[model samples]
Target: AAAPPGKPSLGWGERTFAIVEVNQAATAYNQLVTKRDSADVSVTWNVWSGDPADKARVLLNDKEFWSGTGGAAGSASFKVKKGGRYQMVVELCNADGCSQSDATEIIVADTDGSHLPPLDYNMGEKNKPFKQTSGKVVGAYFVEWGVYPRKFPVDRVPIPNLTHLLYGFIPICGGDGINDSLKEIEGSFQALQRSCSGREDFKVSIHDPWAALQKPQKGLSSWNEPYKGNFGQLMMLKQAKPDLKILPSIGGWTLADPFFFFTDETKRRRFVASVKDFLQTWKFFDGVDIDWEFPGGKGANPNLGSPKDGEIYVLLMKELREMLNELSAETGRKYELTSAISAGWDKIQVVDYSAAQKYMDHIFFMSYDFKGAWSNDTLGHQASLYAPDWNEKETYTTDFGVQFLLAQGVSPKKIVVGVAMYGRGWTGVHGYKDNNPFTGNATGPVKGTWQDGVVDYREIATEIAQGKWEYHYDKVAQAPYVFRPATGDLITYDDARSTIEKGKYVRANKLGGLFAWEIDADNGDILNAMNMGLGNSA
Candidate 1:
């Protein structure tokens, strides 16, 4: 296999995205097989993506299958299985030698997606949502798009487990004609040109109308209700747990570019008025949580604006605080304003959190994402509690991020540490199967659920718990990584153990609280551990 990596000379597998009937098999395909003079080529197959835990030949199959080993220099056919993304691989060997190649990545989704749980249009008996008496917030982001394949609608959020639900992304459109980022992520012409944008010039607009107001979540009668979709469901969720505070977090990575242009002095007055009107229409929203990707720098998009955007971003917060105050006086209700800051010092240092923290309630210090596919696909503990000795990068761990924030003169009580509910992966590592410390560049991002590079935590945990992936724990880093030994794939993420450690750190440091990047990816593990770590458990 070492002679320029050609052993049996296996043929390439075709990458496929299949939509099949629920609980049924997909089409069968062949894998090329070549043997060097040996009569028999022993072959073994395994799942590289969705079904890793099964462990054996048929055991490895979720909803896919393997057929004839094929004649020498020929390929074999495989029957499709489960209605989920399955990255597969196979090994072929003559008596003397063998070679491994990942089969084509096949993403299988249900044709009707009837496999997912039906929408819960009715409310169950209210269990009092857990209120954190610790004076520390336990927050999470509930993304509107999660209503699709992730199936994490507003109702699925575990209100009993959180004190705050930061509603992700009501985009600020109309201010800028170029909202291509919104179009890119939402992938809909309707999402880009929603009528709401025209109604309130340069105000926050609904990103997903079907998911936000038109999905008929409370059953058919909801179609006639004031709102339907996530908006309707959240009204019920808020009613069930009256203490649960929900804040509409504006300007995520996709919308961050427009934020720099729109949140200016002229355009923002319309923005402020819109927020007030939004609160009046949806009383469930308690306040605002701004998540401008970066103030003066570039974020997911390369677009950047004024170097003084740091000052402008913070000034917007002051106006928001005053507006909230004015609204609070009219209604006799307290309103809060907060912002999500960056873990990287470069992004953090640009904004004066010392001043921003004054007008805001708590600053969510995003401590994870220190390492990601963006850094040329560099690999490590993406959310390490402490910097591992093996890492060469600066400010690459949770402690360093939090410590930097502390030194900025922000109150410990006003700082909420961030944890990730997903993983960032890299493929084709040099020493993946070895015990060597994680080092080196990856060819690129590993395949993802919705997109490339990012994967849900549940998918990672599901495979790891099945004993399919090799798990590693670095005591020094207080972080965990699971390796796909066969595929040379590495997923760096925060597991329950590391999160518990972070929670312990939060309690020990008397930090404001803990929050996850987004709760949609969770398998109910991270949040439970978060509560336990924060000492909010039974």
Candidate 2:
């Protein structure tokens, strides 16, 4: 009397976890779904692993949903009412029939979980294992200046999935021109708000800087003055689009010079007050994004002091938090504050990481620009996790900013993985024609589409439509790449296939979410693919 294959071993509402799949390329994986016969468990469910365009799938009790249509991983939630016998399934498919398998688990919580008072499921429902929603790895960029907000790529957007858009970025220190900078940036922010409209599943935040006390910047006055144009734009944008949270960004590539003044108690107090005053006056910004460039005694000045750097930094944040709390009570609006830092392993050794957690909402690791003009060649691919250890020659380039941050106590749930819509390049290389010039192994070192080492979807989609670009899978990296052999251009960008890999990682770890530099850079196909890959749930 053995149990049949692909059938539940326990009854529904029993809280037994299960998964069954057919025809997939899987080795060893378990199900997150708890099988029960209750009507509460019968409803549809989804798992979100950060990337909106990641590869994932769904299950209705024992059987996997979206059988076989390149429907990989996705994000969603489920609900159940009556209890009964049920099973769980796991599988993977790519334009072919499914190869399924099964696994079992148990549920031991309140069977009738819902959002109502009796059910009570909000952020408060902590520690309950996620059944329908899979975890995701999130990454964001406090991108300085006009790096991520270019227009015209809206029509060709990337698909959305379960990822965090928490970190804020300022487009460029300078915009269209002198007078129209604020207006132009306002339009861009509005565009972002419109793009994210109606999707309660997501949230957006941005950073703006304070302006110097002067006549020319009469219209601008945030805590940090170098961010004059940015602050004005954020204030106006927040006024128009209440949903988008625009926070003031202090410190940048050029603005880190003021730490000498802030290191003192009086100046620090003034700085905090200035921020409070700005927030009170504008009534639009959600909070502040501290772009310290680097903690005291790093980067620009040695006299900036490191012995008290960690203590002082934490002190500043504590005061800011206190002010924000009072402001929240006054305005009836909640504000979230975060910080940005560098991701290099060596550079990471400087600042005091654990100290800032008390006052900040999240920490943004500046994971890109790993290699730039300073490197001997374009030697590193900004956001990789593993270097080529299996390869014959010792190769670098594949590293993760997440790893560095994690070592410093930054949780994946509280952390975001950064991806650049750009690439890095080298001026000189030998025997290379087109993007795929045979350079012993990989074809790189050529100039990036722009100086930023990235090419936008606006540019990539055109390449795909004209037959100049084609997709190729990379088994070694578990991702995909597109190459333009004609212009000596070879770009390795993630697509549905790669996103699926990331999705699985999110589910397995129960992490928080995924993030990208700028949505505008992803081709719309990526977004649609995400919708198809993930499931929607209760």
Candidate 3:
């Protein structure tokens, strides 16, 4: 029986595996699959020379996908000799004979073995070396979820253009301890380091460390035992890429409910001790990133908010810094302590910056999402670098956010401003004109390729190339927009011009660096702008 659409096949003893999809668009095709496993598991792919079973079996162009091996979870990318339907089989076993049989189809292309289509967008010419300056942290956040429809591999990363890569959103395991519940993130990290081998300046950081505040293990006695979780995989990654920095980020928009974990001294000490023990045991993590949505304000989880959160947030940082400093003294190597902070002034007021900045190594200011579909009455720039004088002072702008941090006694050299690589749009608009925003009455969010009211800059570029929309530049906001006159849809976003302006702003202000919310969003257009503005390109 065939596996139902959108779900994998279930096999013997409930051990299940499924070949989810194939990427024929690239010359080095990838077979993405998922499996549920309680014991040791492995998978193998047999490519047939012909359609029949007795036909000649061609050895796979890539050897990693062959034979019985390590963990059963995540996807693997490989190459094949010809284009056809291939078969994938999974084998599971433990001390007890665990038996599971599952197979799926893999479609490969027989083209001239080319990876990508011709370069349509100008990714800039004659690569110039991007020199790293002291205290600068030029990096981009690489979301783990981009692997699906986007199919962005580590090879696609602009490694030479970046100083660091923040792998985003690794979930917490309640109180069971840190592990790769989502196996693919570790797989992606392995792929990223493999793709950029021998690159010293290119460091990778696990962006999200949202974990339970409680200590799961009894007295750190079993810390050194055989670990098979995400933390284990991270240690494996460190072995593979010795320079990899595992920074677990805590507190995101959805997972902030348990943030009171930091407020309680006993819980905070236990959590800190657990984290320190885990890092010491694994010897992989280089730092920690606290992504508390807002110190005292309400977020998506409103109940998580508290007036004391502001003071407690500062106190937590102070404790964390003291512990990290003690560890650094013992290990003779500094471990970084950074935080992802809010850009809104309302949230900013609650943060005790003078007290907090004293403990942090770097402060990541998320300066995007200033406007979006939520503004039903009007449409405006989602990540404008600057707002016009006519615009409300409260309007969230990148400059305002960065400057606010600077005003709060944060060293400009320690501040990293964010640059967005996507756009926000509105579907029903009454009026449409060049640079005249908010004049049009917006009814609701527009449909995007992946989500509502949002689209990647690459998609927008494709739209521009196909003449589906006309481009308009807003001088006041220093951002670009695409107007679909026929449907009265307006998309506000950043491009080379706008993104470069951000890089220039970083340099002009002598800021520490610029870090993007994500790297997979643009097709290197915004990255090139960063390079050019940061004086990396001529």
Which numbered prediction scores highest in lDDT against the true structure?
1
- Poorest lDDT segment (10 consecutive residues) of candidate 3: 28-37
Give one digit per residue, the lDDT tens place, for model 2 in 1-538: 3321121122223343212111112111111112233223321222232222323344546554433222223223344432234444443333333334344442312211111012111221111112224333333332333323343111111112323333233222221221122342345434333322342211111222211111122233333221233233333333333444445566544344344345668757766766675455434357877766566555544434355565666787888899899888876878877776666655555655666676777665554555443443344334443443243232222234455556677555555434444434333333543443224233345454544445654465567768876555546555444555545445545555544444454444443434455555554444333322332232
Q: Give candidates' CA RMSD values in order.
A: 24.7, 22.6, 16.7
User: Could you tell me the lDDT of residue 139 within candidate 2?
Assistant: 31
Regions more than 4 Å wrong, model 2: 1-149, 152-244, 259-261, 296-312, 372-378, 389-400, 426-428, 431-453, 469-473, 478-500, 525-538
What C-alpha lDDT does candidate 1 achieve relative to the native structure?
A: 0.67
TM-score winner: 1
Misplaced by over 4 Å in model 3 are 1-135, 173-246, 389-394, 432-437
Determine the backbone clash count of candidate 2.
Answer: 99
TM-score ranking, best first: 1, 3, 2
Candidate 2 lDDT: 0.42
Give the alpha carbon lDDT tens digit for every residue of 374-480 in model 3. 88875667788888545656458888887776787877877887888888898778764554655677888878868888988888888899999889877767888
Evaluate all candidate structures by whole-model CA lDDT and list the values in order.
0.67, 0.42, 0.57
lDDT for 282 (candidate 1):
57
Full candidate order by lDDT, most accurate first: 1, 3, 2
- Candidate 1, residue 196: how far the Cα is off, in Å: 4.6
lDDT of 1 by residue, 365-447 (tens): 78887777776535778888887766635576778878887788888888898999899887776643246436656777877
